[PDB]
Amino acid sequence: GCSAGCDLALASFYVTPNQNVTNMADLFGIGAANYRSLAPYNPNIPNLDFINVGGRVNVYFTCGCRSLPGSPGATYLAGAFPFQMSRGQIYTSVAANYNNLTTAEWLQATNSYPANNIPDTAVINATVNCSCGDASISPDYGLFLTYPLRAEDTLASVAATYGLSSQLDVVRRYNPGMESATGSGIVYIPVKDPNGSYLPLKSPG
């Protein structure tokens, strides 16, 4: 499980036709009015009004350690984005906006209401998995990108895309159960902060 979280994680949001950055900001609790706060995390997107289909946008969030409701002692690391309910909304339609960053089944598992009886006045959480690293794996990496595999993607090919081929062994240790996965599932990739650091971890006591 997890003991505590960290204050920053990133998600790789694949760009589909007619997506826009204010909508991505809204989905991650940033608020449309503050979408420009995404610029330092996306140096390859100099104009946030133009995002190309098939591109990716990095979106930031806080990574909290949460208990899974109704499960025995299970905890997990994720960002939680409150979503105000109204009549007509279902876990499937909430999850649809995040593409492969979450799933209806995972929203059901992380929220405390049964799918078939969510009160119309309640607030549910859209939850996106993250990692904060592990000092016992490496003190070097304290910032991770949540990357949904798609198409032919493998952990090796993704890690190579982010310059991490020579550390692939270490990358595999952050992604247990996904060393053999291809084209589907979420992997966590160490990435550099806007100031160019991997944000090394403090020595635990």
Ligand X SMILES: CC(=O)N[C@@H]1[C@@H](O)[C@H](O[C@@H]2O[C@H](CO)[C@@H](O[C@@H]3O[C@H](CO)[C@@H](O[C@@H]4O[C@H](CO)[C@@H](O[C@@H]5O[C@H](CO)[C@@H](O[C@@H]6O[C@H](CO)[C@@H](O)[C@H](O)[C@H]6NC(C)=O)[C@H](O)[C@H]5NC(C)=O)[C@H](O)[C@H]4NC(C)=O)[C@H](O)[C@H]3NC(C)=O)[C@H](O)[C@H]2NC(C)=O)[C@@H](CO)O[C@H]1O
Ligand Y SMILES: *[C@@H]1O[C@H](CO)[C@@H](O[C@@H]2O[C@H](CO)[C@@H](O)[C@H](O)[C@H]2NC(C)=O)[C@H](O)[C@H]1NC(C)=O
Ligand Z SMILES: *[C@@H]1O[C@H](CO[C@@H]2O[C@@H](C)[C@@H](O)[C@@H](O)[C@@H]2O)[C@@H](O[C@@H]2O[C@H](CO)[C@@H](O[C@@H]3O[C@H](CO)[C@@H](O)[C@H](O)[C@@H]3O)[C@H](O)[C@H]2NC(C)=O)[C@H](O[C@@H]2O[C@@H](C)[C@@H](O)[C@@H](O)[C@@H]2O)[C@H]1NC(C)=O
The footprint of ligand X on this chain (CB under 6 A) covers a number of residues equal to 15
92 assigned ligand-binding residue? yes
Which of the residues 93 through 132 are near ligand X (CB under 6 A)?
Answer: 104, 108, 115-120
Q: Which is nearer to ligand X, 2 or 122 (CB)?
A: 122
Q: Which is nearer to ligand X, 40 or 183 (CB)?
A: 183
118 assigned ligand-binding residue? yes
| CA-closest candidate to residue 127, choices 153, 98, 107 | 107
Binding mask 23-62 for ligand Z (x = CB under 6 A): x---------------------------------------
Q: Which is nearer to ligand X, 39 or 104 (CB)?
A: 104
Residues annotated in a binding site for chitin: 87-93, 114-120
Chain positions contacting ligand Y, by CB under 6 A: 68, 74, 76, 80, 102-103, 106, 111-113, 124-125, 129, 177, 186
